[PDB]
Each structure stands twice: as C-alpha cells, then as structure tokens.
Write a protein that binds this ligand. Structure first.
Ligand SMILES: Nc1ncnc2c1ncn2[C@@H]1O[C@H](COP(=O)(O)OP(=O)(O)O)[C@@H](O)[C@H]1O
Ligand SMILES: Nc1ncnc2c1ncn2[C@@H]1O[C@H](COP(=O)(O)OP(=O)(O)O)[C@@H](O)[C@H]1O
Ligand SMILES: *N(C(=O)NC1CCCCC1)C1CCCCC1
Ligand SMILES: [Mg+2]
Ligand SMILES: [Mg+2]
Lengths: 466, 54, 128, 467, 128, 466, 128
C-alpha cells in the first residue's frame, strides 16, 4: 500500500501509512521522481508514522507526496554479472553500459555469520612490503586496516596492495569507494581497463566496482559499504572461493551516520558522534569476514580525524582488525614511505608458532632498538647526539639505518617518484634486518639504506657514494 | 690546540641546544593554546548536552 | 553459583571499556541525560556493583569464592583518566601495562610503581 | 497517609498522594516487600506528586504499589547501644546480632551548630607519622582530610591512624563506611574484635560502625554519611565525652548525589556535577565539628577523580578542613609511602606560636630544600649535574635524603612493605630532619634513609649496607 | 554609609569565587541558560555592579571613600579561568600569589613581577 | 502602540502587543519608572510576543507593566553639540551638563555603506607622528589595533591623535569606552579637559565621548560601540569629514555579545563565544570605511585572552585590522616616547603601490638597519665594540640615531613636559630618516635626534653649546 | 555553465574558512550537535560536495573544465586542525604559504617542500 510524506529535513523523511506499516529496514520508493529515490525505514515513531533515511537528494519533495513500500530491504544485483561493472548504493549501473542482468538479487542488510561459522586457520599473506611482512604481517582471509591522517598515504598503499595481491589473485575482487574522490574512481576504472582486470568486450573481468563518493548525501554514503560487502558475500559463499574486498574509506561510513544522527533525534555522544557509533560499526564489520564456507581478505582504509587516533571513530575500529598498519605524519615528513609507524602497527599473526622463531626474533629485535632510540630522542632534542654515551650512539646509528631500510619505493608511485618500484621476498626481508642488527653494516652510511629493495641494493648504493 | 677545539665546540653545541630549546618553546606554547581552547569547548559541549536532554 | 556452593570460580570481563560504551548507548537512547564524558552520571555504580559480587565467603557460608579480573583499555597510556580511575577505585589492585616496556622486551609489560595489590602477602604462600 | 507509585526510573521514584502530602525529607515505607524499602522525599512535583530517592534497590516495584508516610525523616538508633554494633543507612543492624535496644532515636537530617557554638582552642595531636607530625600536624578536635587519587594510600593511612590514636583513645569512636569496599568493612570489623576495640561478649565496645558500600544504590550512599555523623553527634552532645569520627570516603556522598541529579531534573553544572554540590556539602560538613558542648576529632578520606585536585568535589572540600594531608601518585609510584606530598599538605596549627619556632623552622626548612630540588630537577635532567656548584649539589643530595626520611614503615602495612611497622616520637622527628638539614649525615648513602623510623635506624641501616 | 558620610571604609570579599558558585546554583535551578563552566551570562554583571560601588568621592560629596579587596581562588594557577578573568578585568589591579613562591620561603607569596596597581605611584607617600 | 510585560528573567524581558509588533532591533520604552528603561527587541517568539534585551536594571518590573514601541531602533543625538559631552548607549547625557541640544537624532543600527558607495582608493591618514607615518601608516577608513595596556602612554597617544587629526584634517574624534571602569572614565574626562581636546567653555571641543560602564548589563555594553559609531557617522556623512573613532576595548565588545548570546539561550561556539561572533563583529566594523563623502578611521585597543593570538576573539578582530600600533614597556624604559615598537608595529599599506616607492624604500631601510643593529647585539656584548667592521660600526651609529629620531614630543603633553609638541609633515619625516640612512649626519651626536620634530631640529639641538 | 559548454572556468573560494564559520553559526542556531571545534558533523560534506563540482570533462561531454582554488586560513601554521585536514582530503594537492618565509622576504612565501600537485604535474608543458 501507499504512505505519504509528513515531514522532510535533509536526508531524514517521515512517512505516514494509513494501512500496513513497513518494518524497520524496508526500502520505500518515492513517487513523482525523475530518478529512483529510495527511503530506508529507520524507526516506527508511533501514530502510524515511520522515520526513514533517503538514499539520494530530497530537494523537490513535497508534504503529501506518495511513497510505496517495496516489501523488503534494499536489494541489489549479485553474481558474475557485477564483474567489470560499476554500481551505486542501490544496485543501479553508473557506467552507462546498460542493465546488470543477474539471476540473483540480495538485500544489503543481513545478520553477521554465527559463532559456529567462524574459522580459526591462520596463514600468512606476504605482500612484498618490508615493514608489513616483518613487523605486522597480513593473513590470508584476515581483516587488514590502514589508518592515516590527511594525505599521509592511505590510498597509495591500498593501490599498491591491489597491484601486489589482487592482480596475482585467482578469484574475484570487490572495490568499494565510500565517501572519497570521484575522479579517483575515474582513474581506478581506467587503470583497471588498461591492465585488463576489467574488460568491456569479454567476460574476463575480475573486479566488481561499487561507488558512493563524497558528492553523495549522507544516507547513500552511510550505506554504500553495505552494498559493496554484499557483493563480496555472494562470491564468498555462493561460489565457495577466495575473495578480496578493498574499501576506501570505511571512516566515511561513521561520518555519514553522524550527519543523519544529528537529525534522527538522538542525544549526542562524545565529540558529537551518534550514540550508536560502536553498534552501527559492529553490525557492519562483523559481515566483513571469512567463514568456514569461504574466505574474504579485506583491506580497509581508515581516516583519522585531526590525526587523533583516540578519536572515537578510529579508536573503535581497532577491535575489528587482524592486522593494523598505522600511517604516521611525522614519518612521511621524514621522507620515509610507506609512512608506517613500526611500533604502533600490529598483527595477531606475529607469533613464533606461526611465522617461525627466526622471523619472530628479528621483528622483536627491530622493535626493541626502535623503542630504545625513541626513549633517547628526548635527550637528543636539546643537546643532540654528540652528548650520548659511546654506546647509545651505537643504538642510535643502527636504529636510524633500520628506520630507512623499512622504507621502500612503490611500483604504483613510479609515475611521480621516478624510481622503479620494488618487491622484496620475505626471506630477503628477515635477513637484511638480521644483518643490520648484528652490526654487519655499521660501516655503511645511513643514506645507503633509504628507499631501496633488498639489502644488496643498500651496499651497492653505499658504493655509488664516491 | 685542545682548548681552541673545546671552546669552539662548546660554543657550537650551546648554539644548537639554545636554538632547539627556543623551537621547543615555540611548539609547546602553540600546543598549550590548542589544548586550552579544546578543554573549554569540550567542557562546554558537555554542559549543553546534559542541559538539552532534559 | 560456585561461590555459594562451597567452590571457587575465576571471572574475566574482557572488557569493561566496551561494556561502558554500550551502557552509554542504551542509557542515552532511553533519554537519560548524559554526564561526564557523555557517559551516564552513574558509570562508577555500573562497575562497582558488579565487582563487589566477587568475594570470599566464610565457612558458615560454605567458604567458597569468586575471583574477578576485569579489563580496562586505556588511551595513550593514561591510567589517570576518568573511566580508568573509577574502576581502579573499585578493585583490590591493578596490573598496569605500557607499550614502551612491551617493546623494550619487558614482558609481561608491567609497570611496578603504578601497579598494586590491596591484599598483599596475605595472598601469598610463606615461601613466596 | 497512603500513596501510590506512579513512576520508577532507577533509584528515583515518583509517588502520588490523594490526601496528605509528605514534606521534603520525610521517610516513606513501601508496602509489599520482603525487606524494608524506604523512600526519601526530595521534591514536590505538583499535582499531589512527590519525587523520591530509594534507600535500597527498586527492582520488583510496580506502578500502583502502595506507599506509607512515616510522618518524619529517617530516624535511627543513637546511644551506647550502638557501640560494637554495625548499622546500615536506616539504622537497622547488619551484624546479625538482633535489635539495637536504644532508648532514643534521632533524625539523620539536622541543623548545623550555630556560630556561637564554635570553639577556637587548638592543640597538637601527635600521630607518630613523621611527615604529618612534622609538616602539617593534626589538632585535637580539629577537621582532618586525607586527599588521594585512586589507590594512593588514603585507607592505609586512616587504618594506621585508628591504630595509633583510637586504640589509646579513652572516649568513643564512630567509623562510617561510605561507598567503599565491603571487603574492607569485614576486614576492619574482625580487626577491631581482635584488638578488643569491639567486644561481642561484654559491653566494653568503644566504637560504633555504620556502613553503606559501593554495592548499594545511590540513595543509600547519599545518606549513610548522615547516618554515621548522626551517631557521632549524640556522643558529642548527649554525653560530651571526646569523640573520634572516621569517614571512608566522604567523596562518595557527592558522587551519589550526582548519580541521580539528572533524574531529579537538574541541569548539570561543570564537570557533570549537580548544581547544588557546594550547598549540599555545606549543610552536611557543618555538622562535623567540635562545639562548646563537646569535641569531635574528624578524619575524612577524600577521593580525587582522575587524580585532579581541581575537580569540583575535592576542590570544594578544602574549605571545610583544619589540616589537609595530600597524597600523590607521582610519589607512591617511587616506593615512597606514605605517599604524602610535602609541598601540598597543610595545617592551621603550623605556626611558631603554637608548635614552637624549632618545630616551625625545621618543617619550613624541609619545605624549602624540597621545592628547590623540584625546581632544579628538570634542568639537571638535561644539562647534567656537573654544572651545579658543590653547595648546589649538596642540597640535591640532602633533598633526596630528606625525601627518603619522610617514608615510613606502617604497622598496619606489614603485609605490603615486608617491614616491621614503626612509630616515631615528635621530638625524634624534628631532631632527625634538623640534623640532615645541618649536614650531619652527608656521608651516609641515600638508601639508609629509606623506609625507617628514627634517624638511628638510618645510621644502622647504613652500617648494614656497608658490609 | 561611611563612604557617603565623609569617612573611609575598607571592604573585603572573601571570596567572590564562592559567591559566583551560589549564584550559579540558583541560575541553573531556575533553568537559565548555562554558559562557560555552566555560569549564567550575567555572572560578570554580578561582580561588576558590586565592585563599581567602591569609589573615591569629591569634596562636594563629603570626600569619603570605600576601598575594595575582592578575593578570587584560582585552580592550579589558571588566571584565565572564567570567574578569575572577569574579576581581573573589573579591578584596578591585582596581587597574585603563588604556591611555588610560598614553599620556597617567599612569604607573603606575592609575585612582584605580575602583580600590579594601575593607581600605583599616586597612592603612596613621598617617603615610599 | 503599547504592549505589556509578560516575563522578567534578569536582563531578558518578554513583551506582548495585541496589535502590530515592533520589528526586531526596535527600542521599547518601559512606562512607570524613575529613570528611562529601554528594551531592544531581539526575537519574535510568536503569539504576538517579543523577546527583548534590557539596557538597564530590571528590578521592580511587574507583569502587566506598560511598554511603548518608539517605532525604531535606539536613537541618539548626533551633531556638533555632542563634542565635549559624555553620552551613554541611549544617548542620554551622563556628564550632568544638561540636555544635548542637537538638531538631529540617528538610529544606532544601520547597514554598512553599499558596494558602489565604497571608495576604491587607498590613502594614508597622516598623523604627524613619525614612528607611525613612516613605518606603519594608518590608512583612511582602516582599522588599527592598539596593543599594550596601561603604563605605556596610551591615553596620551589617543589625545594627540585627536588633536593632530583636527589640525591636519579638520576631522573630529569619538571615544567609545566599551566596558569603561567608572574610575578611569572620570580620569579620562579630566585628562582631556586638562589637555584641551575638550573645552567646557566654548564649542571648540574636538571629541565626543560615549560610555558603556562595566556595571551596566550586557546589552548596553554590547551596543555602546554602535552608539559611538553612529555619532561619528554623522561627521563623515553630513559634514564630509575624516573622523577618528576610538574603541576601548574591542575585546569587551565581544564579551558583551557573548553574554547577550548566552542569555538568549543560544548554544555557544568554540571556546565559549557566541555563534554569531563573526557577524556581530562584521555588521559593526564594516560601517567603518572610506565612502565617497568622507571617512571613519578607527583605533581599537585589543586585549588578548591568555596571550593567545589564535583565540577566537583576537583572531576574528585581525580580519579587519589594516595596521597595528604596539606600545611597550621595554621601549618606554629606553625613554623613547611614544613607546611604539618599530619592528612589532606594522601596516598593510606599507607597499610601494600605495604609499609610493620613496616612502616604501626609506621605511624598509629603517627596518633593516634596526634589524641589523639587533643582530649585532651579540657580537658587541661578548667580544667588544672595538672589533666590528667599519660597515658594522657605522650601522650601529646610524641605527641608534634612527631609533632616537623616532622619538617625538607631543603637544598634548606640553603641560607636563614644558616642551612644545611637534606635528611632523609626512614628506619631512620620509626625508629626515633618508638623510640619516644616507649618512648625511654621521658627524653628529645621538642625543641630537632624541625628542625633536623635523630633521632641522636635530642639526640645531646639536649646536647648543658644544 | 562554462564547464558544461566546452569552455573552461577558474573558481577561487576566498575563503572557505569563513564560509565554514558562517555555516557553523547557522548550525548552532538550529541547535545541531556541535563536534570538534564546535563544527557540525557535516562540515566535511559542506566542502566535499562543493569541490567535487570542479572537474575535467571528456570530449564526449564537450571537453570543458572547472578548476578550483579553495583558500583556507590556518592559525599559527596548524595544518592538522579540523577544517584544513578536511580540505586536504578533498582537494588534489596544496600550496602551503609560510609566515617565516614571508617575514623573511621569500615572496611568494611558498614552502616547496610541503606543497604538492601530482595531477597538475602530469598536465605541465614539456618546455617547463
Ligand atoms: N608510498 C608513497 N611513496 C611516495 N609518496 C607517497 C606515498 N604514499 C603517499 N605519498 C605522498 O602523499 C600523497 C598523498 O597520498 P594519498 O594516498 O593520496 O593520501 P591519503 O592518505 O589521504 O589517502 C601522495 O600524492 C604522495 O605525494
Ligand atoms: N603506607 C603504605 N605502605 C606500603 N604500601 C602502601 C601504603 N599505603 C598504600 N600502600 C599500597 O597501596 C595500596 C592502595 O592503598 P589504599 O590505602 O588502599 O588506597 P586508596 O587511597 O585508594 O584508599 C595498598 O593496598 C598497598 O598495596
Ligand atoms: N589493616 C589494619 O588496620 N588492621 C590490623 C593491622 C594490624 C594490627 C591490627 C589491625 C589495614 C586495613 C586496610 C588495608 C591495609 C591493612
Ligand atoms: Mg586518499
Ligand atoms: Mg580506600
């Protein structure tokens, strides 16, 4: 049956139904619109009225306008037909290539996998990036989070990871743009066509795209991630295989929710966030996961407001990750990329029984000397290095060489750095760091270690230093 | 030779130390004001939230 | 159940930081006016109430007991904040861990000056 | 009069009265309950409805449940019959020993003694604790407050003081357990039976116990302090004889009040507290006092939220005291116990005309060498010690020694220090600190001064340290 | 009374910090809008009309006077807190006291560097 | 028409009218009172009730009490008969000298001059004050921030600027004391009378005073600047003059506004200021400019909360200032009066395109030599003066002479110094220093340039005896 | 209009800091929940939807473009504040100006170390 609009404020719209009230989460269709305008039921206000969240602009709506109950939550296309295509929050094609002719649709809302469906197999996923492989290794089918303040390198990193893992992946991938740059979506789309991971002439595409960028209204941005992960859920189960899910940037989910919460009547929580921050994130994140039926290896870029990691958004996200890569502004300003903080990045896989005692001991060793150097930096800030004991001068020296050896040229940044990108094998990474720790290069100049691949390149560079 | 090296190195070392100090001073001060402003704002939003809920 | 039937049980609440965030959510949605740091004005009572239930019973009462190890997550190593001091002010001690010690090789990463036990040697064998 | 509950939100209950409307502060008895449930009238909302705070849990209550007005504020047993007994907020026995057969009862809400009832006499009360007796000495019949963030030593200090002052004490003592640890109450209770301070067989008990701990809901924690001081008032007035009053922890009275403030419909004041913090506190604190009729020596433990003494609760408490003992985490963290901050503890009697200029000057000398080291610390931590003069660094070493001679092995603390408790006479304290200031020990090592009693033990420890 | 009848009076307000707290209590409970530190927008006005009543009259008015010594309690030396800020700007000058000075031996603990009297020189005898 | 009081809450009063409501900003006259009570309309609550802010105490008001709508915003006397008089927010004389018999009255609220009414020109408002004119010139229609509280010769600077602008421009002045301390208002009054800028006998007074005493409610303290602004607009628009408007102090203007905002129940902004911080400041400051007819130049004493220049108050004020005058103790303790800091004080119009290439080059020269002198302080202190290079030694002599030539005796202070004041014409100032920099006076003693007018007066003072 | 008709336009927003304070004013008066620095949760969106309209159209759409030069004002060089961090993450790069370079004569006062423009670098003349 039909209902009518009784109120409109931004993305929040109230609708009265004289007969048959639509349950929470149902999708409603507004009548008299040139393009599909969906309203998602958020709550039953009483007096046969419901409060909803619009998935697109509400300009032009009039009190009295007719609204239809679709009889279910937002449903989108899923299956092999999504590959090589670009869709929006509500499953519509936005690549101008015609209808997505799937045999299956799915609701973007659903209960998270049950406890009995969780998997406990732990296996490393070697990225070829030194800092990550050594200190806080990623895991096949695990959850990876990339934290970073403004312009510190989150996107470059996720792109390098797509370049290093997604390409050499047998299965399918899903990329979800959430509240980020549209032209970044245009670059990505054209880059994937160039490389063939997307094909507009055959059925060989390997990636499915979902976008709801920073040009979209709050409701859309608050739901695009659900849409993206819904496409990935299909590949996970309805094919029993390995899926990669990339998301830039999941923070935008929480920010968008913060915008409507201000209009849903909620009393604000800390820093003006919605009181439901943690549970909103919880019912969403718990779906982004590997189950006994299939695996999802997820990589989520996470923005950090004002560079404050104690901001509720980021601080609540840590609990959802299997590996955390925290980018640092102070590191990036030192020229060290990727700007990964080696002491604030962790992995649930850094365990001797998983990666081996050699790998385990070399990581603890690096972090130990970095922390000792850190504890000194305070005394160095005023007086400097010249005032240190002949011994502390030594930890300083090796530490500084280690900080630079963690740095590395990316293939995906070649276009602007002018340096060939590098991919170092895990065995080569452990060794290099062992040698520095053992002192085998105390006679090599720092600069020799900055922005190279394997250890051999450091020595070679130390030679070109004549 | 020694005292000439020593007095020129103490001069240099103390030039730096002093310049680092001042820089540190300038930064802590700016950090102080940012913090001072946020505490007030923070404490005030907290009062408003409580009052509005009534 | 154990505590009162002549037995001994050990409980771990991992963690109470997140339980307080949920309490805050439910309380604000019930329209109870927020308090300090947006938490209900009675966050202390939320936890004091619970932890008092861990106890040693006398023989007349079966002599059983319940031991509790609540967990609190700090932000930037600030044991002195509000939520953290509340809970400390309830428990019979605390084990404080810092990331600096954890990375230097001190594991378990306990900070000795800041941790305490309010029962002391009365909880130790003569040997220890 | 009979009422009907019309609303229940946590500890706050609204009752409706068809006829007589009970005045603010009256006690209402809820009908239909296994155990006595009392409601205290806080406000008259209008339309014959009153707002109340419950003195025990509200689970089980239903809208429409009958409530009776007792026709008066909560009244409890007072008198010699409370000695050796344990009561709760509403004067019921909680020691499983039966009825408190008192001949009189008394309201827990009372007007404070008038200005014409005050006493100005002030005499030293030696505790045997070096830092206190030296820097901020307590006074007989005076108000003493022990400030401290969570876990810095408040309770251990109050237990030590009870041990050193209340055992000898020939009058009566009252201990109020206010929103603290139930375990601590069972501890204290058996402690006192052992010391015979409490006697379960004869009638020689010298202490009355009142408890309302952190296991209780806010209404009970907001009034138990009143209950305890009400007991103390009777001894002061209806007997005159000297009274000791210990409260752990009176902050809990203020916190209780804030737990229900918003439910009571108030706009929050700064830091989430009730707008009535100061006046609430004043009408209670003004009752804890010596008068011309009799003396009360009060010792109150005072919680400091987030370790911030500028917090409104602790900050509004300084004005009601005669002697402040401030405890610090920065000091406790160093192994220094009691963790007293020597540069933030004060006493109204620290005056040369009251304690003698020898006592005054040494105390004052200790404070100066310590403030001077403290001001020095950060500088030498950067430029090193070498730039100090032989005298400038001689103060650095004595300062550290003095800081160590302030620590002390508490008798009550044996289970923590692994050391035999110690009690130092006032004269010995002054002497010892005087000698260090004079330089008479510049050749002994620092650790000799750490955790000892009298200055002789420092010398002896130094010998034990040599070889 | 003295001021207007050709005599001189000295009034001491110890302290205005506590007066402002009481006024705040009443404003919050009357439900007037809360501002910085929960004080009402008229708390400045509260102190300004009080301190302007101190004054030096001319001959035609009897030549009498009324001098005021208001007292403010700061917290952790924050002279930029709200109430302190208000009374510092109202007054003709200020005598700042410091804890560090006090325990160092400087008593009265007055900071001669910051303390000021805009009246200054005009209020002291030739000798001084 | 006449309304009735329906509510009294401190300085906020709600008034109800049965007929036509008075527009926001209209002045209401309360009936049945010993002294005139004015109410400025703030909002239209609905139900024919307005919410007003009070210009005086509200004790004694009763619900039902009659109020008249004056039909317009607050109106005060404007015209020549305001000069030498003292007025309050509502235009009443508070100097006990009787009525302010003007031919006209003007509303204190007004729109700023329109775009087409603006003057696309940028001219310097010569002050005759050497430090200022040369190094950090005042711009006609611009805003000057006066830093440095008491003890640094502020009051005398104010009086002399008044005097000088009257001589060299025929323009009058207006002193707006926002939050004036009564004691200081009485003293400023007598100092102006004693200095002559005010005359109680003839109509030669050059300044109109307007006070908003600290003991008045927030609304009056918030509107006084407007009052004084309105008096000055009279001289610009009706007499085509170049007026001087002093606002002491602009920070208390912001605090009053903050207090008014607090009282109307508006939610506070960052650091507790009114949400309208920038528009409150804007609707006022913009009235101060150069129109086709004349100009209002404003010098504003600025208090900086917690010495923090980034605090919202000073930060908002800086958006309108065209130059600053910094008065310091350090310079006062060197005997250089006025105690203007030659490197701390600045002006936006210190540009060749505006004050000309000659003025600019001379200015820049003085700044550099003062900088170079400050840089030599080290090498001279510990080492010796008899070691600087001939170039350096000379830059020390020219610099010291320069810093003395920036000194200047004022007329206003002829009663205290016994020495005649000086009004130095711009071209004379530019040239005087040009000659010192040129080195045309290296054969004279420093003390020859200390406390004089034109350069000639330096050469003369030198001849003295020897 | 130009962007969609095969032509090219340049737009300067001088400045967005002030636009954001104006919007904050509108939001607070509307009583919307203030967050960091008291800005509404939707200040990011205020600028994102705006600058997203600066774009380069392909030939199938006329080949026109709209280039945007948003201006942001910082306080004491704090480029990690809320607004500045918002805009950094909207735009395609930044030209940082520094007081010290300026107050030293280096004009324009561009910090060549921080400033970036990746997409512009690819669209630069071969000669340059
Ligand atoms: N791995 C890297 N190598 C070199 N420069 C990098 C790297 N990562 C980031 N940068 C620099 O930082 C800029 C911002 O990176 P980006 O990923 O777009 O920021 P964000 O964290 O906002 O997503 C890049 O344009 C580049 O100049
Ligand atoms: N004087 C002391 N000597 C040794 N340890 C002490 C002393 N005071 C406190 N402690 C230690 O610190 C713990 C916390 O002290 P407690 O008095 O319970 O703190 P609170 O101020 O929180 O009431 C004690 O259980 C003990 O472990
Ligand atoms: N214990 C204490 O005061 N009781 C005993 C101590 C030994 C002598 C008899 C009394 C303290 C109670 C609080 C915690 C620390 C021990
Ligand atoms: Mg990015
Ligand atoms: Mg305790």
């Amino acid at each position: 049956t039909t209902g009518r609009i009784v109120a409109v404020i931004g993305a929040v719209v109230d609708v009265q139904f004289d007969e048959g009230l639509p349950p929470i989460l149902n999708a409603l269709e507004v009548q008299g619109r040139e393009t599909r305008l969906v309203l998602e039921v958020a709550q039953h206000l009483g007096e046969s009225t419901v409060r909803t969240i619009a998935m697109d602009g509400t300009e032009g709506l009039v009190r009295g306008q007719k609204v239809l109950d679709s009889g279910a939550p937002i449903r989108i296309p899923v299956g092999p037909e999504t590959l090589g295509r670009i869709m929006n929050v509500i499953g519509e094609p936005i690549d101008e290539r015609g209808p997505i002719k799937t045999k299956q649709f799915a609701a973007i809302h659903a209960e998270a996998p049950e406890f009995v469906e969780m998997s406990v197999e732990q296996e490393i996923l070697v990225t070829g990036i030194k800092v990550v492989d050594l200190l806080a290794p990623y895991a096949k089918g695990g959850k990876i989070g990339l934290f970073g303040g403004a312009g510190v390198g989150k996107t470059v990193l996720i792109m390098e990871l797509i370049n290093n893992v997604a390409k050499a992946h047998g299965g399918y991938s899903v990329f979800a743009g959430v509240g980020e740059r549209t032209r970044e979506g245009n670059d990505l789309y054209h880059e994937m066509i160039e490389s063939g991971v997307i094909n507009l002439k055959d059925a060989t595409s390997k990636v499915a795209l979902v976008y709801g960028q920073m040009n979209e209204p709050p409701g859309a941005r608050a739901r695009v991630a659900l849409t993206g992960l819904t496409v990935a859920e299909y590949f996970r189960d309805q094919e029993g295989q390995d899926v990669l899910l990339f998301i830039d940037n999941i923070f935008r989910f929480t920010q968008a929710g913060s915008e409507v919460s201000a209009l849903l009547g909620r009393i604000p929580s800390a820093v003006g966030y919605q009181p439901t921050l943690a549970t909103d994130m919880g019912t969403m994140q718990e779906r982004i996961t590997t189950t006994k039926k299939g695996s999802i290896t997820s990589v989520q870029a996470i923005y950090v407001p004002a560079d404050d990691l104690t901001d509720p958004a980021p601080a609540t996200t840590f609990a959802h990750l299997d590996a955390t890569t925290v980018l640092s502004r102070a590191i990036a300003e030192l020229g060290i990329y990727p700007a990964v903080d080696p002491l604030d990045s962790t992995s649930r896989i850094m365990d001797p029984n998983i990666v081996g005692s050699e790998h385990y001991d070399v990581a603890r060793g690096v972090q130990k000397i970095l922390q000792d150097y850190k504890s000194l930096q305070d005394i160095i800030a005023i007086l400097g290095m010249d005032e240190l004991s002949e011994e502390d001068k030594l930890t300083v020296s090796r530490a500084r060489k280690i900080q630079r050896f963690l740095s590395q040229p990316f293939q995906v940044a070649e276009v602007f750095t002018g340096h060939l990108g590098k991919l170092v094998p895990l065995k080569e990474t452990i060794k290099g760091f062992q040698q520095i720790l053992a002192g085998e290069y105390d006679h090599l100049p720092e600069q020799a270690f900055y922005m190279v691949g394997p250890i051999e390149e450091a020595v070679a560079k130390a030679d070109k230093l004549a | 030779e020694s005292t000439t090296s020593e007095q020129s190195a103490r001069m240099t070392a103390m030039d730096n130390a002093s310049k680092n100090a001042s820089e540190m001073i300038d930064k802590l001060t700016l950090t102080f004001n940012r913090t001072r402003q946020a505490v007030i704002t923070k404490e005030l939003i907290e009062i408003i939230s409580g009052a509005a809920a009534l | 159940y154990f505590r009162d039937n002549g037995k001994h049980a050990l409980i771990i609440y991992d963690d109470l930081s997140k339980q307080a965030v949920a309490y805050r959510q439910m309380s604000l949605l019930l329209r109870r006016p927020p308090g300090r740091e947006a938490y209900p004005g009675d966050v202390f009572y939320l936890h004091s109430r619970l932890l008092e239930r861990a106890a040693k019973m006398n023989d007349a009462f079966g002599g059983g007991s319940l031991t509790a190890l609540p967990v609190i997550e700090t932000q930037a190593g600030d044991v002195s904040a509000y939520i953290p001091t509340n809970v400390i002010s309830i428990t019979d001690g605390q084990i404080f861990l810092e990331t600096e010690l954890f990375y230097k090789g001190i594991r378990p990463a306990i900070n000795v000056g800041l941790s305490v036990s309010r029962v002391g040697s009365a909880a130790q064998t003569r040997a220890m």
